[PDB]
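Handout, section 4.2: multi-component inputs.
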Amino acid sequence: HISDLILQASPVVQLVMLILLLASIFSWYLIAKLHMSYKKARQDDEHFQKMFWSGAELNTLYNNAQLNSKRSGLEDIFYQGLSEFFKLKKRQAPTSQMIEGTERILRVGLSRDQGSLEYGLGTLASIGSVAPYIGLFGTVWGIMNAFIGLAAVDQVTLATVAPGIAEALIATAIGLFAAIPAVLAFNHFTAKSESVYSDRALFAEEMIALLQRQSV
Amino acid sequence: HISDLILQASPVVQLVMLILLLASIFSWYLIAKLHMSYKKARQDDEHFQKMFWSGAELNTLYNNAQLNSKRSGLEDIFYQGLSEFFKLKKRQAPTSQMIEGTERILRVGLSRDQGSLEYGLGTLASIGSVAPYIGLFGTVWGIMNAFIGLAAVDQVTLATVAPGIAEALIATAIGLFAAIPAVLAFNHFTAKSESVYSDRALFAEEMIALLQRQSV
Amino acid sequence: HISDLILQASPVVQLVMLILLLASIFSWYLIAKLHMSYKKARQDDEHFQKMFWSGAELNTLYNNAQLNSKRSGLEDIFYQGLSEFFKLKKRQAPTSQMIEGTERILRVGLSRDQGSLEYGLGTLASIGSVAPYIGLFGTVWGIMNAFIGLAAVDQVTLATVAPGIAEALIATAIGLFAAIPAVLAFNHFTAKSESVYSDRALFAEEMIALLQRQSV
Amino acid sequence: HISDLILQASPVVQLVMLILLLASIFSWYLIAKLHMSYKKARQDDEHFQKMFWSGAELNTLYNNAQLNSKRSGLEDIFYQGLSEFFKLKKRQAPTSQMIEGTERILRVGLSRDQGSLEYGLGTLASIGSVAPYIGLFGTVWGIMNAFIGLAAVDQVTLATVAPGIAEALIATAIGLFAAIPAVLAFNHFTAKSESVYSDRALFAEEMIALLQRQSV
Amino acid sequence: HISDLILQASPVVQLVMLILLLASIFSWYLIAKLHMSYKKARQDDEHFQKMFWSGAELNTLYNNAQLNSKRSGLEDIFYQGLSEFFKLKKRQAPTSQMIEGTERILRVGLSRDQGSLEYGLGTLASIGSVAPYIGLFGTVWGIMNAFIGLAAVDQVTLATVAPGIAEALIATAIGLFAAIPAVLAFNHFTAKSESVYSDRALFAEEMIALLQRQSV
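Output:
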């Protein structure tokens, strides 16, 4: 029956209800994209991180990464890091400089891949914050195309207004239904984003340490 | 018909409705200015960034920038950066100092052009936050020039109050309509602003690296 | 007529309405003080900043500042900065130290004059945040000295309650009227405060640069 | 009697009420886990911190920690710290480096154990923020399966709607009851988390100081 | 008369009203403790700060502090600072190190006494944020032990419900009355806390400067 009400409403409330059902649908597409992105990230980070803290030397690891054309996440942040370090050593620079250099070009890798994991995470924040109040605008337009209507009729039976009051609440309900899934995913992926940054940041620190020692 | 109601209302609610329709109109002007500013920024950043990471040497690039009187964005941040570096080298200073110097005067370029991209972005935050509650003040004044009125009449027909209740909801609706476009643009341009800062910041880091190597 | 209602209300709602009309009046006094403070700041910053980047040498500028007893803003932050630098050089310290020193005692000038521009800016944040909800407390007390009253009367005519419902809405209206001017000035002066800090901070950086070069 | 209402409601409001009673129950499980985690942390920190600032030398303490397989919190952050310091000294590196090294690998211990104390603290923030508005969605669905119903009946007795209005308010009440215990524990454990970070951070600083002196 | 209503209410609303009157009372106790703590702090800071920038040498000041067993605030932060500096100099360490050392052990004094001024300041933030919504839960329980009641009676006189609607609003009023004094003191003491940190931080910077000069 609810389907019927949405079909037979003021043009304005109907546009609010499309703006919001599209926000709902886009929310859900982003929540699928962000979930895939942050599962690939977590998986490849564990794979590389394991292999790096496995016996095989830095040089060995660097060889493989250079060979792979599918370098992604930590593996690419590592390749870009050591690429700098090897490129400097060849120019017989001081260790102090070599480390400082390699530590700049992998803060310029852990920040240029955070940006590409958090693809839609800001949109979900908007959808989540605005959408409730797009709904509310629909509600107010609805309650205000009752009372504007009520004046005209001979008799103010509650039954006169009520069909119009419903078509208001529908819009605020749709508003809350667009907004809730998108503030339980701007919350869950903002968390997963800080986890992955921290995991990779602490791996970067621990890789630096290795290089300083392997130097002296 | 709605037009009619706004025309025939209490002086106070009418002033709330002008304060808000002007906020709406100014929001929209800022949302056009910010959109132009951040598209020129993104376009010129890609152009320069491409050309810099193209084969041509630093000196070549510096020549062109000095020639151009339309220096804007990264190109001006670069000119001001290297201008410092060339100005120091001529005073036979230590490399360490030369880099530190050039790295200060282009943190004093990526921060004195962020401020000029984000022209109106703070206004949109105000319009977006306050305007809902300017509307609400209109609503309350409206519901309170019903009930104050209701007392006077012989008979409290719902039909008596309803024309006055509408002219309240209109103000809260206009309030939400000023405020929604300006919290979907204090959200979208705050994002585009952090993108452009990060893009230019990471370009600054990568330019520093080049200079350190080209030194030793 | 509205004046009449405020005069003839429950003692509690009347105290809410004084607490709020005083917040309104104090808001407005602070919004005048903050506006004067941040216009003098912006004016003197441009004057000094112009004169400094004018031809005249550091020593010349330092002379004048020492002479003036009305040293304020950048001019005092500069005097305190160079005063350190001159005081060190006389103790034949290393350039490196001289700069580091002068750069500490003018981060201890750009932070001990930010605090004195932002005189009342935190109060406006309170007035702006609380005052809506002081009003709401008045509203609830009002709606709750209707219904508590309604029980007593022989006949529940809407006309019985309505004079009491109004005197509630008045309090929430006054609440919104205290709070709106003080969240469009905790927004506008927080902005002007960050502008002046940034302007003076970037001037401090550019003054440091001069001193480092004038050293070597 | 309340039990009866929840049993006899629209399928949708019933699902809102399960989503929320589960959030309530999970909140409470997390509030128990976080309380155990932060009491063990506070207890072991005091034990170690006491013993460290007790007479016994660093070497003595390091011996014991290496022996213990139950190393947790400060004791493990200390073992990982000194392990670096001892590992460097053996490679006859400069004191300056030894300290810098040991100070990196215990910022990579106070940050990889903060993450494991704050196990569920982010969930409580979600439950606390969303759950009120899941409830509200239930409320609106409820008020909107009254009015949609009201139209149908011959007579609009208040008594007709009221049984349906209740089953709405139940959902917003359950919504507030899920959300309040979880914003008085995302507040209380965010506090206890910053306490434990600060306590351990300041212990790390004071341990560094000891090592620098014991060096020279 | 109001007293009567609170006495004759549903067990649940009565528990909400005790939870909130206790929050009110605890708020007020904390607002007294925080006010004493931050007046002693401000007073002793001015006393010491005056005496330090008075003629008497560092050594003189250090003597007195060592003598006093009532060392508190800046005076203790200073004693702990110089205690480090004197303890290093005796171990004939380089000036550079002596300053760095003394500057670490008084960032580990301005942060271990901020924590002890801000005793209850976080509680006031909770009371202030939650308490409104504890009240609202009481309100909803109240409006929902009207309508659940309304069904039963033969006749739905407004006069039937109204005694029950009041006992709801009382709870939201008490809710706002717990919460307002505690967001005008989590605002006023968060401010006074940042003032005292800044005052002491800038004193620490200015003390460091003295030591560096008195060294060379």
